[PDB]
Amino acid sequence: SAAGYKAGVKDYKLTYYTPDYTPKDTDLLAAFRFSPQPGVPADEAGAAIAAESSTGTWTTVWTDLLTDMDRYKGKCYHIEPVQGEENSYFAFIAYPLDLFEEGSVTNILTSIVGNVFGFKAIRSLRLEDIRFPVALVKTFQGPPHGIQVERDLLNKYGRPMLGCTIKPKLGLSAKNYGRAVYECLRGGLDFTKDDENINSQPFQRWRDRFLFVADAIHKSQAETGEIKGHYLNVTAPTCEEMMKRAEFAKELGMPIIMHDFLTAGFTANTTLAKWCRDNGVLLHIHRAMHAVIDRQRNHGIHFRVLAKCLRLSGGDHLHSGTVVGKLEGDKASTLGFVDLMREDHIEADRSRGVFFTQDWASMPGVLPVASGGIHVWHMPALVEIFGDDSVLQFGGGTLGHPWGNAPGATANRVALEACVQARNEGRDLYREGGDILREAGKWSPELAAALDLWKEIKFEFETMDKL
Amino acid sequence: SAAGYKAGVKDYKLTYYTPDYTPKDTDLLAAFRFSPQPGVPADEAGAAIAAESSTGTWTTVWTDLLTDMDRYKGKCYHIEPVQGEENSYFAFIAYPLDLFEEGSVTNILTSIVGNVFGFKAIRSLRLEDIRFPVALVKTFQGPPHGIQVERDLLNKYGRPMLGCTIKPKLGLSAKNYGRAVYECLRGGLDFTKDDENINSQPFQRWRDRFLFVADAIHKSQAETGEIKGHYLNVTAPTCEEMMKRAEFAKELGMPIIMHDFLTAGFTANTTLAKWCRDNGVLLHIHRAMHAVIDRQRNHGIHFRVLAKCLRLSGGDHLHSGTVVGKLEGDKASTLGFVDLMREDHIEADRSRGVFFTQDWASMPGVLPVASGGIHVWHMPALVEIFGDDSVLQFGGGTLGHPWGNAPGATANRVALEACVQARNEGRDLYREGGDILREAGKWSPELAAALDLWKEIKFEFETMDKL
Amino acid sequence: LNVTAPTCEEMMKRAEFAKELGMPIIMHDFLTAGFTANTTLAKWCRDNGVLLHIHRAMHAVIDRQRNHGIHFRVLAKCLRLSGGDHLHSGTVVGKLEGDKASTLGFVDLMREDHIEAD
Amino acid sequence: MNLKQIAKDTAKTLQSYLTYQALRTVLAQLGETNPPLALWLHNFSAGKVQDGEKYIEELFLEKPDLALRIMTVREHIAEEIAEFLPEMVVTGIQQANMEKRRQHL
Amino acid sequence: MNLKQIAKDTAKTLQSYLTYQALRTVLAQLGETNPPLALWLHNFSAGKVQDGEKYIEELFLEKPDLALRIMTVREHIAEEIAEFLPEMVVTGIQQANMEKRRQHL
Amino acid sequence: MNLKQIAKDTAKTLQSYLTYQALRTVLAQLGETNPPLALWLHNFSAGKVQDGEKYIEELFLEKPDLALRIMTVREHIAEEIAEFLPEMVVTGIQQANMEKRRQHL
Amino acid sequence: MNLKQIAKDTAKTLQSYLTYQALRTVLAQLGETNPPLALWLHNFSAGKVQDGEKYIEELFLEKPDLALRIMTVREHIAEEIAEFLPEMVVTGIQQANMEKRRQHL
């Protein structure tokens, strides 16, 4: 029965370490990587994590006996040492479906990563993966549109889409912003975008940018006969401002906006994702601040958890990294979470960092966006890695084209169309990408100039050893 | 003039390393701790951080010459090696006032910590401090009320306030929740609170909890003749839900609500802080998830930056740690950021982790809340460390009182009133706290039982060495 | 188009129709209507992308004599804060009074970012 | 100031304080995981912690399982904290000394 | 393993034992130098050796100069020996455990 | 399979590839900080990178400043990456071998 | 210092040089074993030694068995020597730099 109240401190592992537990399909599962403080056994540390992220605290309370603790408690059901590493373990913890508010990524994170990372008895803690049960996945809207609906809205089929962040990051007036946008889009890029930190500032107020950018989109679309877009950044100080900015973009008939989901937050993001669905505006998601959280493997949250959370909260695009560009991205890991954000069913595969099999119950996929420090020479690798359902973005790699902006834009537009044509013809972008680019460089001087500039250390060394 | 466009990659330090720069009083200053990758010089790494958090990208773009880059660029003006540590440096970077959206913590963070933490050329990066210029501080509302207005609203003077998180974290029905609340409050605590992950769940929907908790507050206030409160958690999936919940709390005449500012986000938080000001509801802020970000000293953001950001966004309380409890808190550091969140002017002091002198231009202070794994034996240390303007919270330390809830509540209420009386009489809580508690334990059996339970390892060892 | 009105409500009603007509610019008499109404209008203009011309009607009641009142350059500073895209500055040479040295001074105050004491 | 002897004796005292603190840890662990065994260990240990080696050997006869647990915890504690004790003891003494002169002298 | 609490508790125990060691030094010095003053301190200190900082503030109330003698010596010892303690306790524990796991396990 | 000779020769090739890669780094650094000196270094270096020691010595006569910079960068690169090369080369060869058999055989 | 790119580039250069070393081995073996086949491979390979994986796929097109001989040997060498390369290159560079900073600086 209610088994008697005995006040006092007990070991967490007496209640919360359950090595004989078999997870239900409605359980939310979490994989943590942890190092206990000297003198703290791994099973007690794993139990403490399970306890303080579900139902438990540091001493025994009588109120437990008013309810059914077995039904509600988090259960550390497996611990394994990390092969080859001293004092590092994986704990696998099951959480009942009942613990979570439906449709709330905010609530899920508050439990799983709310307090346990600062526990004295633990040196370091990193959340590697979460299996979201299908019953919970169905309480979320997910992407406002998702990959296939987006291609259909934009009439964009048969190859990766191309984007470009306007530079300098900050400092340009609204009119000069639209100027740079027009010249980029007219040259063959599908999208341009606000920098993540372009919101509304003294040098460029948001409503002016929206106005001038809309003009640039109309002119370039009229000239090229292809659908153009520019991710207008609605990231704002408050929910009210965010919505005010989203609203004007809709008023201008803009097809796509962007949002910094982490610096604004999941509560504002989930609001925006619902609005986007109701108003037919595509939502590009920038991951600003993620590396504060996900870079080091001993402590934090791995990006693949953040990617899963974003697909639930809602976003049509999400930056995925480049692997080859100026910012860090492990290839095996990247291939793993690109599958997690695109596909409907992803088998567990530890070699790609996927700890749990994840089902999405037909929740739309999110387009991965490869951006940051990439140029034309990267193109065959990018097409190889990400395939057709991706957006490849070149900020400096467009606006930094030796002859200026318009030739820089043409270089990127030609390079893109050459790759799409080749892909459609059956050429392998991974194996033949460099060649496809060299070919096009033969008749495009401005592409040739760009290929030369950003080719980059070659190596090349030497033969002696003669008989 | 516009100095000619030469396309191509340059070193960041040619533009962004400015060791002869003297920061203006309107500049936002940031102190980063970084380790460069082997082969990357410290000044280039510092310049890259300044570049990619302000105006720059990886290659030269012609658009720079349309504006005045000198006016807008981030400026790494000082680098110093971290004493005693290999390959670790502090970079101090100045950002012009013009770069930031007024009243937006979201925008500030998007620049300072948006992309630079994931830069390949940097191994690890940790933001230690930001000096917010007074001209920027004035664009924010700050705390809805702040310390002195809160004491005046609640008629609470002369000692720390006392709170208590209800346990188990999850699993209790609404009625059983209000039951636990009533019994805690009637016993002498000023506040109780929802657990950070108590939002709205199958076992307890939010509107039911708000209803039953309001009843508990009225009954306990009527019995004790002291103002009572319970931080009702309005943390929600969306802005709309958040506001719906805040609204009902106001309708019930509830004096105080709580919000998880990091898991919900700064955009939702800033919305809530403004609403609280307009509606006269106090706002308690829970720091759930902060340790994911702030625990390790090689990478992340130090809590004292998050505390500063929260005071700007808005909160009346903010958890500060205990130093002595179950979760980590460095004492010197804590004394530093407690000053940062309370005082109007805080001098630079590296021994307490305060890199920059910070002025607040009469923006109200935030009450520090010490919570987590603390019990009666900690009381004299807590009063010593935090002083009168703090809230000390005992969840397990109230509900875990060997005889059950009501005696557990009385133990805490007696311990609190004994400390407030002693303080008011001129007794030193730090030096005499244990004694004050022993005294009260003499005539309160239920306090004596609690003191015994959580006293805690004593040591005690031995004399031999006789002549 | 002059939206200067008896009440805030009427002022806004008139500003709204100008926007509905797609008019690029309206005007407001900031002193006879007042700073509270003007500040409301300046915020609306920002949110609705309408330019705001400011007429200084009544200023000379206040700023003409040098022994008593408020000099126009204070009113110009206040208007730049409250909000206006244009502000009448005088002509120096026309039918209404304007001291040249003074005028060059407050023209700098209303245009520039940094104005040295002089 | 027989330094080899003083260090030797300080080390033995340290070793035997760390043993006592490993005891407190496993006692607390057992309070959660095995309440009756926590009680047994507490009652057994009362007035036995002066010499850490003598203590562990007494515990080996009754509960070799627990002895081995304490042995591991004391070892772990030392490995985590030992390197920080020289600073803490030197600067603690220097600050404590200097606080006593400020209060009185 | 509340490691900063354990370390904090360990340093204060080292400081109290080093204060006892210093008191032994000063006592042996006064054995050569001032036999009366030695006899006063030996009888004053018997049983008082519990908390080193409390002992010092109490000895300051009676004889501020002699308290200062113990203050200097405790600190001199600490500066000379403290840096050797980590390696001694860690290898001490590992060696003492290694003995017992060999015979028993 | 003269292993001491093969390792020796592989090491010299490695050393001289890391020198070349340190060159690329400082060239890129200089492209940002000192464009004319980047150009000088690029033009100077063209067809000189076969032997890394010969290269650095040639650079010492003209620009001892740059030579010392490259020396530091090659040293830093090696210290960061050298330990990961054995796995990368062994498993790379094994995977490359086995990809060639799968395509053809 | 794009460190994973540099390492990636370095491993592929080590793999190509070890393929050249294996080709030298197989060649010396066929010198004892099959002098004709040796002469074919020596003339086939002159100038082809650029990219090791391209060389292998091209040798597979002509003589699948001999390509396999080079595949095995490159891999045998790698398994035997690769683990010694880190320490050799790091201390090699440090020693070569140390020489030059001594004479010049």
Question: What would your notes on this structure say?
Answer:
The structure is cut from a larger assembly and holds 3 copies of chain A and 4 copies of chain D (105 residues). In chain A, strands 5-15-14-11-9-8-7-6 form an 8-stranded parallel beta sheet. A 5-stranded mixed beta sheet of chain A has the order 2-3-1-4-10. A two-stranded antiparallel ribbon of chain A has the order 12-13. Chain A has 2 domains: 13-140, 2-Layer Sandwich (Alpha-Beta Plaits), CATH 3.30.70; 141-464, TIM Barrel (Alpha-Beta Barrel), CATH 3.20.20. The N and C termini of chain A lie far apart (90 Å). The longest helix of chain A is centred in the last third of the chain and has 21 residues, at 405-425. With 467 residues, chain A is an alpha/beta fold. Helices cover 40% and strands 15% of the residues of chain A. In chain A, helix 13 (303-313) packs parallel to helix 14. Chain A has helices at residues 13-16, 42-52, 69-72, 105-112, 134-137, 147-154, 174-186, 206-224, 239-251, 261-264, 266-279, 290-294, 303-313, 331-342, 379-386, 396-399, 405-425, 429-443, 445-453, and strands spanning 28-36, 75-81, 89-95, 122-131, 161-163, 191-193, 229-233, 256-260, 282-286, 300-301, 317-319, 345-346, 358-359, 367-371, 391-393. Chain A contains 19 helices and 15 strands. Chain A is globular, with a radius of gyration of 25 Å. With 105 residues, chain D is an all-alpha fold. Chain D has a single domain, classed as Non-ribosomal Peptide Synthetase Peptidyl Carrier Protein, Chain A, CATH 1.10.1200. In chain D, helix 1 crosses helix 4 (64-81). Chain D is elongated, with a radius of gyration of 17 Å. Chains in contact: A-B, A-C, A-D, A-E, A-F, A-G, B-D, B-E, B-F, B-G, D-E, F-G. Chains F and G meet through helix 1, helix 3, helix 4 and helix 5 of F and helix 1, helix 3, helix 4 and helix 5 of G. Chains A, B: Keywords: Bacterial microcompartment, Calvin cycle, Carbon dioxide fixation, Carboxysome, Disulfide bond, Lyase, Magnesium, Metal-binding, Monooxygenase, Oxidoreductase, Photorespiration, Photosynthesis. Chains A, B: It is an enzyme of class 4 (lyase). Chains A, B: The active site is at residues 167, 286. Chains A, B: A motif (Interacts with RbcX2) lies at residues 456-462. Chains A, B: Its EC number is 4.1.1.39. Chains D, E, F, G: It is found in: Carboxysome; Cytoplasm.
